[PDB]
Amino acid sequence: QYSFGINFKSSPEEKLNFDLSCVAFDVKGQLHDTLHARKPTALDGALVKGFEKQALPEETVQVEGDDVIYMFPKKFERQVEVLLFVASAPSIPGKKHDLDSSSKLEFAVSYSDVGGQAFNQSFDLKPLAAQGGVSSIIVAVMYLQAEGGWTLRSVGDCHPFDSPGLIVPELKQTILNLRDHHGVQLDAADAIQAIDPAERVPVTRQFQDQSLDEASAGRAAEPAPVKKLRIDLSWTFWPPPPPEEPPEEPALEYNLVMYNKDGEEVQSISTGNREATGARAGRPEKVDPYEFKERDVIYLDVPDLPAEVRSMVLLVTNYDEENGFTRVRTVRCRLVDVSNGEAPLPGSKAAVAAAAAAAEQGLAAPPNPERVLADYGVLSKYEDDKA
C-alpha cells in the first residue's frame, strides 16, 4: 500500500482547493488513465482518491492528509509503466488564485506495504511555488524497475497553466528527461520519439468558466472564432436489482433552455421539440465505470441564434417521482468546437474507410479538426441517488 498527499489546509474549515492529480503512462507511452477530484477512481480501482470512502479495498490504511490518494501496486496491469504527479490550483477569473496563496504546502509520502513499520516522510514545495506566479508544478514521477518495485524520482519544474492535461507535452518531456539525463531506462521512452505541441486531454473542474475562443485556442497562439458548437450527452445506468419481473431502465430527457434578459424562455430545444431557429438536434443523416457513449447530439450555430438570448442552460432529468436518480450512474456532457469540421463517427463505415485509405504519414490517424473544450459529468452512487 502506498499513500501520497498534500496538506495545505491548516484547518479543515477553509475552502481553498488544491488538486493533486496523477497521470498514468503505459508501456506504449501514450496517456492511458487520468485522475482528479471529479474522477475519484482510475485504473480498475488501483488508484483511489482519499475523500471517496468506497471503491477502495476493505484492507484499511488511514492517513491524515487532505487530498490523499491511495495506490495498491498488486492490482496494476503490466502495461502501466509511469505515474506522474501534478499539484495544481484552479484559476477563478476575478482573483488571480495561485499555488503560493496558502499558509503552507507540503508533500507527504507513505510506504506502508511492509509489515510492522510504516515509512512516512514530508517534502516541502512552498519555496518552489513562491518564485513567480505558478499554478501547476510537476511534483514527482514514479516508474517501475525491470526487476519490479517502484522508484520515486523528484523532477520539479513550475508552469503557469493550471490544468494537468494542458501540459501533456511537458509531462512527456519529463519522461524523456528521466530517460536521457539519468541512467535508468524505460521502454516507453524509446517509443516517445515524436512530440506534438498541441496535444491535450481535457479536465474540467466544477464552476470552471472560460471564454469559448480561449478554450478553443489552448496552447495555440492563434485565436479561433467559435462559429459552431456540438453538445454531446451520455448517461449510464447501474445494474438492476436481481429480483421476479425485470425492472426497466428509465428513459431520460434533455432540455436545453435559452433565456432572455427579463427572465423568460425564448426558444428551447428538447427531446420533444427537436428543432429551434438556431439549434438543430440529432446527427445529420470489464465494466467501465466511466464509459462514454453518445445518446444525442445538439448543435448550435453561434452567429445565427436569436439576438435576444443571453444564457443557455442544459438540464437533464426525468420527472418521475419515487425513484430519483436510482439506477442511474453517470450523466456527462462534452462540448466540441466543430467550426473547422466534424470528425466522422468512430466505427462508421466512412470513418474506417477514410482511415484505411489515408496513409499514416507519420500520424496514426488524420487529425480530427474537432477540438474538445469541456468534458463535465456528474456521478451517482448505487442507491443513495434519490430525492
GROMACS .gro file of C-alpha atoms in nm:
model
  387
    1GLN     CA    1   0.000   0.000   0.000
    2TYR     CA    2   0.121   0.347  -0.100
    3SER     CA    3  -0.021   0.682   0.017
    4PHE     CA    4   0.052   1.022  -0.141
    5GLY     CA    5  -0.093   1.355  -0.034
    6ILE     CA    6  -0.058   1.728   0.001
    7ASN     CA    7  -0.153   1.909   0.323
    8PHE     CA    8  -0.227   2.278   0.270
    9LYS     CA    9  -0.546   2.337   0.466
   10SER     CA   10  -0.410   2.417   0.818
   11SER     CA   11  -0.778   2.394   0.923
   12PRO     CA   12  -1.048   2.162   0.780
   13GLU     CA   13  -1.291   2.456   0.759
   14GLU     CA   14  -1.108   2.653   0.489
   15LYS     CA   15  -1.242   2.645   0.134
   16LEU     CA   16  -0.941   2.699  -0.095
   17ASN     CA   17  -0.896   2.389  -0.309
   18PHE     CA   18  -0.579   2.233  -0.449
   19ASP     CA   19  -0.597   1.931  -0.679
   20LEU     CA   20  -0.322   1.671  -0.659
   21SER     CA   21  -0.369   1.460  -0.970
   22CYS     CA   22  -0.196   1.161  -1.126
   23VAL     CA   23  -0.136   1.081  -1.492
   24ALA     CA   24  -0.053   0.724  -1.592
   25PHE     CA   25   0.166   0.624  -1.885
   26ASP     CA   26   0.165   0.276  -2.037
   27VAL     CA   27   0.443   0.075  -2.200
   28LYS     CA   28   0.330   0.229  -2.529
   29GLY     CA   29   0.395   0.577  -2.390
   30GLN     CA   30   0.057   0.735  -2.461
   31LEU     CA   31  -0.170   0.868  -2.189
   32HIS     CA   32  -0.369   0.574  -2.054
   33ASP     CA   33  -0.569   0.684  -1.748
   34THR     CA   34  -0.620   1.007  -1.557
   35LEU     CA   35  -0.709   1.103  -1.202
   36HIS     CA   36  -0.854   1.413  -1.035
   37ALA     CA   37  -1.123   1.523  -0.791
   38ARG     CA   38  -1.400   1.472  -1.048
   39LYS     CA   39  -1.278   1.118  -1.129
   40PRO     CA   40  -1.202   0.960  -0.788
   41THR     CA   41  -1.109   0.614  -0.915
   42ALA     CA   42  -0.881   0.523  -1.204
   43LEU     CA   43  -0.704   0.208  -1.323
   44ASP     CA   44  -0.964  -0.054  -1.218
   45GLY     CA   45  -0.952   0.057  -0.854
   46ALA     CA   46  -0.573   0.064  -0.820
   47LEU     CA   47  -0.568   0.443  -0.772
   48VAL     CA   48  -0.835   0.569  -0.532
   49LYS     CA   49  -0.890   0.923  -0.409
   50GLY     CA   50  -0.897   0.970  -0.033
   51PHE     CA   51  -1.227   1.152   0.008
   52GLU     CA   52  -1.420   0.869  -0.157
   53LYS     CA   53  -1.500   0.613   0.113
   54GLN     CA   54  -1.596   0.348  -0.144
   55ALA     CA   55  -1.430   0.175  -0.442
   56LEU     CA   56  -1.128   0.103  -0.218
   57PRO     CA   57  -1.020  -0.236  -0.076
   58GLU     CA   58  -1.151  -0.348   0.263
   59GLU     CA   59  -0.794  -0.355   0.397
   60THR     CA   60  -0.772  -0.017   0.565
   61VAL     CA   61  -0.488   0.236   0.557
   62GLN     CA   62  -0.578   0.568   0.718
   63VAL     CA   63  -0.368   0.883   0.672
   64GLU     CA   64  -0.401   1.243   0.791
   65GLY     CA   65  -0.351   1.444   0.471
   66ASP     CA   66  -0.604   1.648   0.277
   67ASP     CA   67  -0.606   1.539  -0.089
   68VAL     CA   68  -0.452   1.197  -0.030
   69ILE     CA   69  -0.460   0.922  -0.292
   70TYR     CA   70  -0.403   0.553  -0.223
   71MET     CA   71  -0.225   0.323  -0.468
   72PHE     CA   72  -0.219  -0.055  -0.437
   73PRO     CA   73   0.063  -0.193  -0.653
   74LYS     CA   74  -0.056  -0.553  -0.690
   75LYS     CA   75  -0.373  -0.465  -0.883
   76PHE     CA   76  -0.184  -0.291  -1.165
   77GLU     CA   77  -0.158  -0.432  -1.515
   78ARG     CA   78   0.174  -0.486  -1.693
   79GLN     CA   79   0.132  -0.206  -1.947
   80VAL     CA   80   0.121   0.082  -1.697
   81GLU     CA   81   0.481   0.200  -1.651
   82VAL     CA   82   0.498   0.557  -1.520
   83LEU     CA   83   0.287   0.772  -1.289
   84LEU     CA   84   0.343   1.148  -1.291
   85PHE     CA   85   0.200   1.367  -1.014
   86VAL     CA   86   0.083   1.724  -1.075
   87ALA     CA   87  -0.027   1.959  -0.798
   88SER     CA   88  -0.243   2.242  -0.929
   89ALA     CA   89  -0.480   2.517  -0.822
   90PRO     CA   90  -0.777   2.633  -1.031
   91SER     CA   91  -0.794   2.979  -1.189
   92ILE     CA   92  -1.100   3.182  -1.091
   93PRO     CA   93  -1.122   3.486  -1.323
   94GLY     CA   94  -1.157   3.763  -1.066
   95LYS     CA   95  -0.892   3.695  -0.801
   96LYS     CA   96  -0.574   3.553  -0.963
   97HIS     CA   97  -0.560   3.243  -0.745
   98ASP     CA   98  -0.226   3.059  -0.748
   99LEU     CA   99  -0.031   2.796  -0.554
  100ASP     CA  100   0.151   3.028  -0.314
  101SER     CA  101  -0.176   3.172  -0.177
  102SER     CA  102  -0.183   2.934   0.118
  103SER     CA  103  -0.039   2.903   0.467
  104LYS     CA  104   0.176   2.602   0.374
  105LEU     CA  105   0.217   2.341   0.101
  106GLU     CA  106   0.392   2.008   0.163
  107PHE     CA  107   0.417   1.664   0.002
  108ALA     CA  108   0.367   1.363   0.232
  109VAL     CA  109   0.463   1.016   0.108
  110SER     CA  110   0.392   0.690   0.293
  111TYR     CA  111   0.517   0.341   0.209
  112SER     CA  112   0.333   0.100   0.440
  113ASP     CA  113   0.336  -0.226   0.243
  114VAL     CA  114   0.597  -0.371   0.481
  115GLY     CA  115   0.455  -0.525   0.796
  116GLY     CA  116   0.524  -0.363   1.132
  117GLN     CA  117   0.688  -0.038   1.021
  118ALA     CA  118   0.513   0.240   0.828
  119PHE     CA  119   0.751   0.470   0.639
  120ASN     CA  120   0.633   0.832   0.611
  121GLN     CA  121   0.819   1.146   0.506
  122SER     CA  122   0.731   1.504   0.409
  123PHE     CA  123   0.899   1.707   0.136
  124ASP     CA  124   0.830   2.080   0.106
  125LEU     CA  125   0.718   2.257  -0.212
  126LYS     CA  126   0.637   2.611  -0.093
  127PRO     CA  127   0.976   2.773  -0.179
  128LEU     CA  128   0.945   2.627  -0.529
  129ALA     CA  129   0.593   2.767  -0.567
  130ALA     CA  130   0.674   3.112  -0.428
  131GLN     CA  131   0.902   3.210  -0.716
  132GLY     CA  132   0.694   3.384  -0.979
  133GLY     CA  133   0.328   3.315  -1.033
  134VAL     CA  134   0.275   2.943  -1.087
  135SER     CA  135  -0.029   2.719  -1.081
  136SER     CA  136   0.084   2.366  -1.177
  137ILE     CA  137   0.408   2.202  -1.063
  138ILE     CA  138   0.520   1.852  -1.162
  139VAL     CA  139   0.584   1.734  -0.807
  140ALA     CA  140   0.722   1.386  -0.870
  141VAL     CA  141   0.748   1.088  -1.105
  142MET     CA  142   0.732   0.717  -1.021
  143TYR     CA  143   0.846   0.439  -1.252
  144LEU     CA  144   0.862   0.060  -1.241
  145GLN     CA  145   1.202  -0.107  -1.249
  146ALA     CA  146   1.251  -0.403  -1.481
  147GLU     CA  147   1.303  -0.618  -1.170
  148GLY     CA  148   0.987  -0.477  -1.010
  149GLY     CA  149   0.928  -0.229  -0.733
  150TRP     CA  150   0.856   0.142  -0.768
  151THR     CA  151   1.113   0.422  -0.780
  152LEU     CA  152   1.011   0.777  -0.686
  153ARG     CA  153   1.217   1.042  -0.860
  154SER     CA  154   1.155   1.410  -0.787
  155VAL     CA  155   1.168   1.620  -1.105
  156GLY     CA  156   1.005   1.956  -1.042
  157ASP     CA  157   0.952   2.240  -1.289
  158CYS     CA  158   0.694   2.512  -1.237
  159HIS     CA  159   0.441   2.613  -1.503
  160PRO     CA  160   0.172   2.882  -1.541
  161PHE     CA  161  -0.103   2.661  -1.686
  162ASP     CA  162  -0.329   2.534  -1.408
  163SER     CA  163  -0.457   2.211  -1.565
  164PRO     CA  164  -0.287   1.871  -1.586
  165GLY     CA  165  -0.360   1.757  -1.936
  166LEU     CA  166  -0.281   2.104  -2.066
  167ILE     CA  167   0.089   2.028  -2.008
  168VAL     CA  168   0.094   1.682  -2.170
  169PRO     CA  169   0.397   1.774  -2.388
  170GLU     CA  170   0.573   1.888  -2.070
  171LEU     CA  171   0.491   1.558  -1.898
  172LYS     CA  172   0.631   1.363  -2.193
  173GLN     CA  173   0.938   1.587  -2.188
  174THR     CA  174   0.977   1.499  -1.820
  175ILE     CA  175   0.970   1.132  -1.920
  176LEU     CA  176   1.231   1.186  -2.191
  177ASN     CA  177   1.443   1.386  -1.944
  178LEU     CA  178   1.422   1.097  -1.698
  179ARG     CA  179   1.544   0.861  -1.969
  180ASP     CA  180   1.828   1.075  -2.102
  181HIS     CA  181   1.970   1.275  -1.811
  182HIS     CA  182   1.951   0.990  -1.559
  183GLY     CA  183   2.087   0.641  -1.612
  184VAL     CA  184   1.766   0.440  -1.569
  185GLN     CA  185   1.572   0.341  -1.881
  186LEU     CA  186   1.203   0.287  -1.960
  187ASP     CA  187   1.097   0.108  -2.278
  188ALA     CA  188   0.818   0.362  -2.334
  189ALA     CA  189   1.071   0.644  -2.365
  190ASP     CA  190   1.214   0.456  -2.664
  191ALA     CA  191   0.868   0.494  -2.824
  192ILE     CA  192   0.805   0.854  -2.711
  193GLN     CA  193   1.014   0.955  -3.016
  194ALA     CA  194   0.788   1.228  -3.157
  195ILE     CA  195   0.620   1.507  -2.961
  196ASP     CA  196   0.313   1.707  -3.067
  197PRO     CA  197   0.292   2.064  -2.931
  198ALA     CA  198  -0.090   2.079  -2.946
  199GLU     CA  199  -0.194   1.762  -2.765
  200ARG     CA  200  -0.421   1.798  -2.463
  201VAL     CA  201  -0.670   1.585  -2.273
  202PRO     CA  202  -0.947   1.798  -2.117
  203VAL     CA  203  -1.020   1.803  -1.747
  204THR     CA  204  -1.289   2.039  -1.618
  205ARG     CA  205  -1.345   2.121  -1.252
  206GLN     CA  206  -1.671   2.245  -1.105
  207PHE     CA  207  -1.756   2.611  -1.176
  208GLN     CA  208  -1.467   2.649  -1.423
  209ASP     CA  209  -1.566   2.914  -1.676
  210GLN     CA  210  -1.373   3.033  -1.979
  211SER     CA  211  -1.442   3.220  -2.299
  212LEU     CA  212  -1.508   2.970  -2.578
  213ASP     CA  213  -1.242   3.119  -2.806
  214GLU     CA  214  -0.973   3.098  -2.537
  215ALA     CA  215  -1.053   2.736  -2.453
  216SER     CA  216  -1.050   2.654  -2.825
  217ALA     CA  217  -0.710   2.823  -2.857
  218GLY     CA  218  -0.526   2.632  -2.585
  219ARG     CA  219  -0.151   2.627  -2.644
  220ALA     CA  220  -0.200   2.755  -3.000
  221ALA     CA  221  -0.137   3.129  -3.002
  222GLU     CA  222  -0.381   3.192  -3.287
  223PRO     CA  223  -0.735   3.257  -3.159
  224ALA     CA  224  -1.004   3.063  -3.344
  225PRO     CA  225  -1.355   3.215  -3.364
  226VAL     CA  226  -1.617   2.982  -3.218
  227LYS     CA  227  -1.854   2.962  -3.516
  228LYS     CA  228  -2.034   2.635  -3.436
  229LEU     CA  229  -2.067   2.406  -3.136
  230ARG     CA  230  -2.166   2.044  -3.079
  231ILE     CA  231  -2.300   1.933  -2.741
  232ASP     CA  232  -2.285   1.559  -2.677
  233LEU     CA  233  -2.473   1.386  -2.396
  234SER     CA  234  -2.424   1.046  -2.237
  235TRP     CA  235  -2.595   0.867  -1.948
  236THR     CA  236  -2.505   0.532  -1.793
  237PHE     CA  237  -2.719   0.321  -1.560
  238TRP     CA  238  -2.640   0.092  -1.268
  239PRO     CA  239  -2.721  -0.278  -1.296
  240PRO     CA  240  -3.079  -0.355  -1.191
  241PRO     CA  241  -3.173  -0.534  -0.868
  242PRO     CA  242  -3.187  -0.914  -0.905
  243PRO     CA  243  -3.549  -0.965  -0.807
  244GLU     CA  244  -3.922  -1.166  -1.041
  245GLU     CA  245  -4.001  -0.921  -1.320
  246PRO     CA  246  -3.700  -0.728  -1.457
  247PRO     CA  247  -3.746  -0.357  -1.385
  248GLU     CA  248  -3.691  -0.131  -1.684
  249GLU     CA  249  -3.428   0.139  -1.723
  250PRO     CA  250  -3.577   0.491  -1.725
  251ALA     CA  251  -3.572   0.697  -2.043
  252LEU     CA  252  -3.413   1.033  -1.966
  253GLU     CA  253  -3.495   1.358  -2.144
  254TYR     CA  254  -3.264   1.653  -2.209
  255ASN     CA  255  -3.384   2.014  -2.203
  256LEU     CA  256  -3.173   2.299  -2.341
  257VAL     CA  257  -3.347   2.625  -2.248
  258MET     CA  258  -3.244   2.960  -2.396
  259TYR     CA  259  -3.332   3.258  -2.177
  260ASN     CA  260  -3.377   3.631  -2.228
  261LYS     CA  261  -3.272   3.936  -2.030
  262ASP     CA  262  -3.602   3.977  -1.846
  263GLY     CA  263  -3.608   3.612  -1.741
  264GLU     CA  264  -3.841   3.437  -1.987
  265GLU     CA  265  -3.750   3.147  -2.212
  266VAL     CA  266  -3.716   3.229  -2.585
  267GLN     CA  267  -3.650   2.904  -2.781
  268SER     CA  268  -3.590   2.562  -2.614
  269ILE     CA  269  -3.455   2.250  -2.793
  270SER     CA  270  -3.565   1.930  -2.613
  271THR     CA  271  -3.629   1.554  -2.667
  272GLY     CA  272  -3.976   1.678  -2.778
  273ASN     CA  273  -3.901   1.999  -2.975
  274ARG     CA  274  -3.607   1.856  -3.179
  275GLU     CA  275  -3.577   2.198  -3.354
  276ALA     CA  276  -3.536   2.577  -3.295
  277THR     CA  277  -3.428   2.884  -3.500
  278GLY     CA  278  -3.053   2.836  -3.433
  279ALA     CA  279  -3.044   2.484  -3.280
  280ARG     CA  280  -3.060   2.152  -3.475
  281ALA     CA  281  -3.081   1.835  -3.259
  282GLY     CA  282  -2.963   1.491  -3.380
  283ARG     CA  283  -2.672   1.381  -3.603
  284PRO     CA  284  -2.705   1.480  -3.974
  285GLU     CA  285  -2.836   1.176  -4.173
  286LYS     CA  286  -1.476  -0.537  -1.780
  287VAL     CA  287  -1.737  -0.284  -1.669
  288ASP     CA  288  -1.602   0.062  -1.747
  289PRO     CA  289  -1.701   0.296  -1.460
  290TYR     CA  290  -1.660   0.600  -1.688
  291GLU     CA  291  -1.777   0.472  -2.025
  292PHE     CA  292  -1.900   0.740  -2.266
  293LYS     CA  293  -2.142   0.660  -2.548
  294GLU     CA  294  -2.333   0.943  -2.712
  295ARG     CA  295  -2.712   0.942  -2.682
  296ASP     CA  296  -2.793   1.269  -2.860
  297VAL     CA  297  -2.612   1.546  -3.046
  298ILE     CA  298  -2.727   1.906  -3.004
  299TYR     CA  299  -2.593   2.165  -3.248
  300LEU     CA  300  -2.552   2.539  -3.201
  301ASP     CA  301  -2.474   2.775  -3.490
  302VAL     CA  302  -2.324   3.060  -3.285
  303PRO     CA  303  -2.397   3.366  -3.506
  304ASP     CA  304  -2.749   3.260  -3.605
  305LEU     CA  305  -2.917   3.247  -3.264
  306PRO     CA  306  -3.196   3.496  -3.193
  307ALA     CA  307  -3.024   3.811  -3.072
  308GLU     CA  308  -3.227   3.829  -2.750
  309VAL     CA  309  -3.081   3.510  -2.598
  310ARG     CA  310  -2.842   3.563  -2.310
  311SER     CA  311  -2.781   3.231  -2.133
  312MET     CA  312  -2.847   2.869  -2.230
  313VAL     CA  313  -2.877   2.612  -1.951
  314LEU     CA  314  -2.874   2.240  -2.035
  315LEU     CA  315  -3.076   2.041  -1.782
  316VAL     CA  316  -3.104   1.662  -1.783
  317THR     CA  317  -3.377   1.489  -1.587
  318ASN     CA  318  -3.667   1.251  -1.572
  319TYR     CA  319  -3.953   1.393  -1.367
  320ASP     CA  320  -4.084   1.059  -1.242
  321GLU     CA  321  -4.102   1.066  -0.863
  322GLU     CA  322  -4.040   0.787  -0.606
  323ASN     CA  323  -3.721   0.693  -0.793
  324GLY     CA  324  -3.499   1.000  -0.801
  325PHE     CA  325  -3.185   0.902  -0.991
  326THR     CA  326  -3.174   0.547  -0.851
  327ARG     CA  327  -3.034   0.306  -1.111
  328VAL     CA  328  -2.860   0.597  -1.287
  329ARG     CA  329  -2.480   0.605  -1.270
  330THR     CA  330  -2.337   0.896  -1.470
  331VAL     CA  331  -2.464   1.191  -1.673
  332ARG     CA  332  -2.197   1.352  -1.888
  333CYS     CA  333  -2.166   1.639  -2.136
  334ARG     CA  334  -1.892   1.710  -2.388
  335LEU     CA  335  -1.861   2.028  -2.589
  336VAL     CA  336  -1.690   2.015  -2.927
  337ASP     CA  337  -1.576   2.314  -3.127
  338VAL     CA  338  -1.684   2.198  -3.471
  339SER     CA  339  -1.638   2.515  -3.675
  340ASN     CA  340  -1.348   2.360  -3.868
  341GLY     CA  341  -1.535   2.033  -3.926
  342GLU     CA  342  -1.677   1.727  -3.756
  343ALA     CA  343  -1.488   1.404  -3.702
  344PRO     CA  344  -1.661   1.101  -3.858
  345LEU     CA  345  -1.841   0.877  -3.612
  346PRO     CA  346  -1.596   0.618  -3.473
  347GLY     CA  347  -1.685   0.281  -3.620
  348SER     CA  348  -1.883   0.438  -3.903
  349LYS     CA  349  -1.819   0.292  -4.247
  350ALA     CA  350  -1.700   0.624  -4.389
  351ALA     CA  351  -1.467   0.681  -4.092
  352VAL     CA  352  -1.292   0.345  -4.117
  353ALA     CA  353  -1.285   0.363  -4.498
  354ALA     CA  354  -1.115   0.704  -4.487
  355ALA     CA  355  -0.873   0.598  -4.212
  356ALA     CA  356  -0.769   0.285  -4.403
  357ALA     CA  357  -0.742   0.474  -4.733
  358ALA     CA  358  -0.540   0.755  -4.576
  359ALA     CA  359  -0.176   0.659  -4.524
  360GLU     CA  360  -0.021   0.705  -4.180
  361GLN     CA  361   0.214   0.984  -4.299
  362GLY     CA  362   0.371   0.985  -3.954
  363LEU     CA  363   0.032   1.013  -3.780
  364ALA     CA  364  -0.179   0.723  -3.652
  365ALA     CA  365  -0.499   0.882  -3.784
  366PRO     CA  366  -0.562   1.205  -3.977
  367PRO     CA  367  -0.608   1.489  -3.726
  368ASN     CA  368  -0.973   1.539  -3.637
  369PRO     CA  369  -1.045   1.914  -3.664
  370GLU     CA  370  -1.293   1.888  -3.377
  371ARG     CA  371  -1.150   2.026  -3.053
  372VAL     CA  372  -1.297   1.921  -2.719
  373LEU     CA  373  -1.348   2.215  -2.484
  374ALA     CA  374  -1.521   2.066  -2.179
  375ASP     CA  375  -1.592   1.710  -2.060
  376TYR     CA  376  -1.806   1.764  -1.750
  377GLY     CA  377  -2.007   1.493  -1.578
  378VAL     CA  378  -2.200   1.415  -1.261
  379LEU     CA  379  -2.164   1.079  -1.085
  380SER     CA  380  -2.410   0.896  -0.863
  381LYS     CA  381  -2.391   0.606  -0.620
  382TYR     CA  382  -2.558   0.265  -0.625
  383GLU     CA  383  -2.862   0.353  -0.413
  384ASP     CA  384  -2.824   0.694  -0.245
  385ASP     CA  385  -2.928   0.874  -0.564
  386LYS     CA  386  -3.289   0.955  -0.476
  387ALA     CA  387  -3.488   1.273  -0.394
   0.00000   0.00000   0.00000
